[PDB]
Amino acid sequence: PPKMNPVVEPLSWMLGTWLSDPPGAGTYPTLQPFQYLEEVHISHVGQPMLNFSFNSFHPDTRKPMHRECGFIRLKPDTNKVAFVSAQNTGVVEVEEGEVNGQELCIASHSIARISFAKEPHVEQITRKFRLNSEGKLEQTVSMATTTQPMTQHLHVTYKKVT
Ligand code: HEM
């Protein structure tokens, strides 16, 4: 209901409640391929930023899996974007980059974790968000871990439900 702060207009295409369709696709050189369901809620309350919650679930049992939440800020009147996330693995990250048209490309510069986080530890993350020609939201996530160089981990497209 609050009018949207002009600072976040360059990312207005991300706003909504979204559901992975088809299921998200998970991979890594060390992992068997997997699928997952994900609910994405991207919202705002009038501040110069977006609020997000991304919650994934097992496609069959619907048991909760990865979860994260945070904020997406922009430098006013620019296309420069900064993303902060806390993840249920006990990991936090700061990613920055830019939006051009309806594509956002960001990369981590800072990652920290809890002392008992499960190994292997992630060292670098990059994400690409885009709105495709059908009006669906796409996210692709890549990462490097202590033992694996930068490569794709996740790809998902979402249907807006709300
Ligand atoms: C930016 C967000 C994420 C990061 C940084 C991240 C990081 C990682 C890392 C470091 C690993 C271990 C890699 C290895 O075993 O070599 C992993 C594994 C895994 N992740 Fe992700 N992850 C993310 C998002 C997700 C999401 C959304 C899902 C959806 C369910 C997911 C599901 C899994 C699964 C199933 C595994 C392997 C579990 C196993 O070892 O059996 N992750 N992730």
Side-chain angles (χ1 to χ4, degrees), residues 28 30-31 34-38 56-57 65-68 87 89 91 93 95 118-122 125 127 139 141 143 145 147-148 153-154:
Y28 214 54
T30 55
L31 303 183
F34 61 90
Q35 283 178 300
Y36 61 99
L37 295 175
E38 188 175 32
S56 306
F57 306 86
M65 296 176 74
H66 188 257
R67 297 172 71 87
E68 55 177 318
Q87 310 187 4
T89 50
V91 174
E93 61 161 325
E95 302 196 28
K118 195 176 167 183
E119 301 170 42
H121 305 321
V122 64
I125 304 167
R127 312 196 192 213
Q139 187 186 185
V141 177
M143 72 190 181
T145 70
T147 65
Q148 198 67 234
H153 180 43
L154 309 172

Side-chain angles (χ1 to χ4, degrees), residues 44-76:
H44 74 92
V45 292
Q47 303 185 324
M49 79 192 78
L50 303 181
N51 305 330
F52 72 85
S53 293
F54 307 155
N55 296 321
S56 306
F57 306 86
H58 190 274
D60 304 310
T61 69
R62 304 228 172 196
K63 179 179 207 174
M65 296 176 74
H66 188 257
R67 297 172 71 87
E68 55 177 318
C69 49
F71 303 94
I72 311 182
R73 303 202 41 154
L74 296 87
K75 210 147 153 41

Side-chain angles (χ1 to χ4, degrees), residues 2-56:
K3 168 155 155 55
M4 186 184 47
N5 190 301
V7 168
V8 294
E9 193 274 339
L11 290 185
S12 65
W13 51 272
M14 296 183 73
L15 278 164
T17 299
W18 304 85
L19 175 62
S20 60
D21 180 16
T27 56
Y28 214 54
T30 55
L31 303 183
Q32 300 290 357
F34 61 90
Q35 283 178 300
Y36 61 99
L37 295 175
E38 188 175 32
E39 300 166 2
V40 164
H41 185 233
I42 297 169
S43 64
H44 74 92
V45 292
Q47 303 185 324
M49 79 192 78
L50 303 181
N51 305 330
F52 72 85
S53 293
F54 307 155
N55 296 321
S56 306

